Design a protein around this ligand. Structure first.
Ligand SMILES: Cc1cc(-c2cc(C(F)(F)F)nn2-c2ccc(OCc3cc(C(=O)N4CC5(CNC5)C4)c4ccccc4n3)cc2)ccn1
Ligand SMILES: [Mg+2]
Ligand SMILES: [Zn+2]
Length: 313
């Protein structure tokens, strides 16, 4: 695999450490950037080199050519996690860092470009399969599958006790990317910080904290520079409207978010999403992990930009 023979250009190493880094212009290097981020945080000799490169390229194969939930989004989510882990060096374990970077790379595995609402409505084999968090359990299942391929188990050169630790950590992280679960997860995190009940030693509090980090990296396109954040918004709407198009073909009227005929209300839609979802998430993450403040600042910068779009300013 050429992945082994790849090294990152020196001029990008400081740019990759920035929270608002955009991997967009470097598609050829995306598999190597993940190797670089694994080797930077976890170090070389953490994974057997060849098995790590099979895994990444196999992980890439199982990402479809959907407009948003694709291979570019997996590495983009994985970079923000790497940026979070690098700026919180002492507060996460060795098995957490390597598990979470793998989880973010696999958190949207085999996405077809469809909401959980769509699948749980048009009787798809995935919704008769997993009744809740439909795509999420399929993502973790596809992850367990790839690990068990020949010469791919990057984690079985490790205990069968340390093994199922990292796999549960991976499962929780991938399940936590279900946005419907984020609202409750965050409101309990907010309360524990009010009363001072947040315990890093308590492992069920760790899982809530990681889940919010998973939500933060999943939405990290709002924490990029305005030209990058704007263009990415086109990608997720093109995948939404395509799902809404398939609903109109059955006589079903989609919700305006999935309706391409209501493009003009996207700016007011983003502003509502930032205030209801994005800003609370990064504000809560910043309170628990102060070094994650640039994500909250960059999100504020993009909210003001959507503010200007609405007003013509
Ligand atoms: C896990 C997850 C992530 C994302 C996500 C990631 C990212 C990014 F890639 F950036 F990271 N973005 N998103 C994202 C995509 C579309 C969104 O859509 C909001 C909206 C609402 C209305 C509406 O109902 N409204 C607004 C209204 C009040 N004045 C008009 C009525 C809407 C209406 C018309 C047109 C467009 C509209 N869009 C919001 C966010 C999305 C969903 N789940
Ligand atoms: Mg997902
Ligand atoms: Zn995702």
């Amino acid at each position: 695999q050429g992945l082994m023979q790849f090294t990152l250009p020196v001029r990008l190493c400081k740019e990759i450490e920035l929270f608002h880094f955009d991997i967009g212009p470097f598609e050829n290097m995306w598999p190597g950037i993940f190797v670089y981020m694994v080797h930077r945080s976890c170090g070389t000799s953490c994974f057997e080199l060849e098995k790590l490169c099979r895994f990444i390229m196999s992980v890439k194969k199982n990402y479809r050519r959907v407009p948003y939930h694709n291979w570019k989004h997996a590495v983009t989510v994985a970079h923000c996690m790497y940026a979070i882990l690098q700026n919180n060096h002492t507060l996460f374990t060795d098995l957490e860092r390597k598990g979470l970077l793998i989880a973010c790379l696999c958190h949207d595995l085999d996405h077809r470009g469809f909401s959980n609402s769509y699948l749980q409505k048009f009787d798809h084999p995935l919704a008769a399969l997993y009744s809740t968090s439909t795509m999420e359990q399929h993502h973790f299942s596809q992850t367990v599958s790839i690990l068990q391929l020949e010469g791919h188990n990057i984690f079985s050169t490790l205990s069968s006790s340390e093994y199922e630790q990292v796999l549960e950590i991976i499962r929780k992280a991938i399940i936590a990317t279900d946005l419907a679960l984020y609202f409750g997860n965050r409101k309990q995190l907010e309360e524990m910080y009010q009363t001072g009940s947040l315990n890093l030693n308590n492992q069920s509090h760790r899982d809530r904290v990681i889940g919010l980090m998973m939500t933060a990296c999943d939405l990290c396109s709002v924490t990029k520079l305005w030209p990058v954040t704007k263009l990415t918004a086109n990608d997720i709407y093109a995948e939404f409207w395509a799902e809404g198009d398939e609903m109109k073909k059955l006589g079903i009227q989609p919700i305006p978010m999935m309706d391409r005929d209501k493009k003009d209300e996207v700016p007011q839609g983003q502003l509502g999403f930032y205030n209801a979802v994005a800003i609370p998430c990064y504000t809560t993450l910043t309170q628990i992990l102060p070094p994650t403040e640039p994500l909250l600042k960059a999100c504020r910068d993009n909210l003001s930009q959507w503010e200007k779009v609405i007003r013509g300013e």
